[PDB]
């Protein structure tokens, strides 16, 4: 309808698609929501896995949003130094009811200046990069600070989106969606956190991330310097 | 030598049934993931999210794994002889025949649940028995080379189970850690067993028209298998 809650996801090249598609299916289950997939122009955008998604609107044509949500992925490093994307995020965040992210999407909120003095989370492997962007780093899976909600790594988007659903509507509505999703997880292993995974698995995870972390640290301090100037 | 994994992408799919497993399995070494429909190109999910089929039935390579997602669109597939024939063709040689949520009703309409333990979404579980399944109230059910997941988000638990079968436990654990899959749901309403009675009543009330229409489709599909 014309009175729909307006929810926008930034959709960028080399996005981690589950960061977007998990929350999308949760939030699209709510009454009279319109969901936008936003990029520089409408059309196909390829996720890091090769899954092809479709942007529905440009930055220019995007209506004022009630909720803005930034997913993460390999493509965040480019977004953290994209003045056009950062200007769009700051413009929308000025009037949004909620300003939100999943996974390394919070590093883009950081680069836009929106984490200064705010509680935030991100993916466990990149959590050290929050503090240089002025955030108070919190090791919790969904973190609220006023109208800022951030989720931790990839699959945290589902917990994040049910939290946001309760704020937009109420606990009863969020619970109904949880039940419709049959979201009673029973993971076959206990390796979802660096605290519970076998030590061998964490060390491998840390080493495989090392070159990405060193590259993102340099981008992060360039982005921090632009907030300082 | 690459493991060939195929998802059936159909109009009015519940996209998370496909996209959850896709991001888990596409994270594995030496896999190639296909999104299959009658022709390549755009296929719109029940939410309005646009996905893109990568291959026609004809161009689909022999699959190691076939996976049928669920959604509003399964009712049409349960009486689509081309889709059912395609699923039987791939199931014949596939190492694993699989589904998530109401995708198991499509496996049932194809004749592939006869005498097998299976699950589906809690609200549609009564439809498994008429399609010949032994209905099991577990979130991921394995019977030989058949794996079925329960409702929508069960696809993530299903896909990690499958990852360990294709590779090993250590490989599945690495992907679980990369996905930070240590769930902390903000409510305890994911099962009819644990949700408040008011929430169950409302979820059953919303599903009622869909369930009645699927009762009718199911009994026509079962009558075809019998004849």
Residue numbers in the entry:
A (entry chain B): -1 to 227
B (entry chain A): 1 to 227
Which lines from the publication concern this structure?
Here, we address each of these questions in a study of diffuse scattering from crystalline isocyanide hydratase (ICH). We selected the ICH system because it diffracts x-rays to atomic resolution at ambient temperature, has clearly visible diffuse features in ambient temperature x-ray diffraction datasets, and displays large concerted motion of an α-helix that is modulated by the chemical state of the active site nucleophile.
Engineered mutations at residue 150 (e.g., G150A, G150T) also favor shifted conformations of the helix to varying degrees. The refined WT and G150A ICH models are also highly similar (∼0.05–0.07 Å Cα RMSD). In addition, the six WT and G150A datasets show ∼2σ difference (mFo − DFc) electron density features around the mobile helix that indicate a minor population (<10% occupancy) of the shifted helix conformation. The near-identical WT and G150A ICH dimeric protein structures (Cα RMSD ∼ 0.06 Å) provide an opportunity to evaluate the cross correlation coefficient (CCCross) of their diffuse scattering maps. The CCCross for WT-1, for example, can be calculated as the average CC of CC(WT-1, G150A-1), CC(WT-1, G150A-2), and CC(WT-1, G150A-3). We find that the CCCross is ≥0.83 for every WT and G150A dataset, and each data pair within the set of replicate WT and G150A datasets also has CC ≥ 0.8, as shown in orange-colored cells in Table S5. In general, the CCLLM values are higher and σ values are lower for the Refmac5 anisotropic ADP models compared to those refined in PHENIX.
